Amino acid sequence: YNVFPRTLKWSKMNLTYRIVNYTPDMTHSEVEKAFKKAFKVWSDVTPLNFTRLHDGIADIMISFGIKEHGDFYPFDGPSGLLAHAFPPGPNYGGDAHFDDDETWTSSSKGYNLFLVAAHEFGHSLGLDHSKDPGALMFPIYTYTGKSHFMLPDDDVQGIQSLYGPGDED
Numbered sequence: 001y002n003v004f005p006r007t008l009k010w011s012k013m014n015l016t017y018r019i020v021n022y023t024p025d026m027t028h029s030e031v032e033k034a035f036k037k038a039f040k041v042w043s044d045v046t047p048l049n050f051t052r053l054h055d056g057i058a059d060i061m062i063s064f065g066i067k068e069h070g071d072f073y074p075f076d077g078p079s080g081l082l083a084h085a086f087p088p089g090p091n092y093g094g095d096a097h098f099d100d101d102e103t104w105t106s107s108s109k110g111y112n113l114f115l116v117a118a119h120e121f122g123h124s125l126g127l128d129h130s131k132d133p134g135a136l137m138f139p140i141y142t143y144t145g146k147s148h149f150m151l152p153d154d155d156v157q158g159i160q161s162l163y164g165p166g167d168e169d
């Protein structure tokens with residue numbers, strides 16, 4: 001027999017993702033690079049593997065949309081909500097949605113796609129919000145302006161509590 005796991009998490013280390021559509025704001029290459037780097041943020045500190053699918057059903061379906069887009073969390077035009085992701089689970093679980101009424105960038109203007117994606121994928125993997133103002137999972141977008149990204153310890157401790165550290169070196 002089997003009882004449901006203690007925490008909400010993926011039961012397999014091999015996860016797949018699919019970029020269903022693209023924002024008008026960035027080139028396909030820029031968007032793909034941003035998401036690849038965002039997934040690497042988490043795979044670098046766990047035993048998780050992320051493989052991209054170009055079609056079909058992936059564990060983490062990524063899409064850009066506006067207003068009503070297929071769930072109970074409609075977006076709201078420019079400003080306000082910017083993105084959301086569902087926790088691990090069947091069907092829409094793990095999916096990540098980005099509000100295309102927002103401005104997405106690979107720089108410091110508007111919302112840095114990589115940064116927001118890293119945050120959203122945290123949710124896709126089982127992390128909720130943190131009270132640490134400097135954590136990636138803090139609820140409010142707080143771009144620091146640093147030239148290099150380093151996953152804050154609070155997030156490292158959080159994701160490893162769910163999946164283990166994988167290779168520690």
Ligand SMILES: Cc1cccc(CNC(=O)c2cc(C(=O)NCc3cccc(C)c3)ncn2)c1
Nearest residue numbers: 115116119135136140141142143144147148149
């Ligand atoms: C090369 C490079 C690229 C990008 C960023 C950096 C520097 N790092 C940061 O600026 C940073 C920001 C955040 C943060 O703002 N977290 C909260 C949050 C994030 C997204 C979405 C929501 C809703 C809330 N957490 C950790 N680090 C360097």
Ligand SMILES: [Ca+2]
Nearest residue numbers: 077079080081
């Ligand atoms: Ca919005």
Ligand SMILES: [Ca+2]
Nearest residue numbers: 059091092093
């Ligand atoms: Ca899914």
Ligand SMILES: [Zn+2]
Nearest residue numbers: 069071073097
């Ligand atoms: Zn949605």
Ligand SMILES: [Zn+2]
Nearest residue numbers: 119123129139
């Ligand atoms: Zn969040």
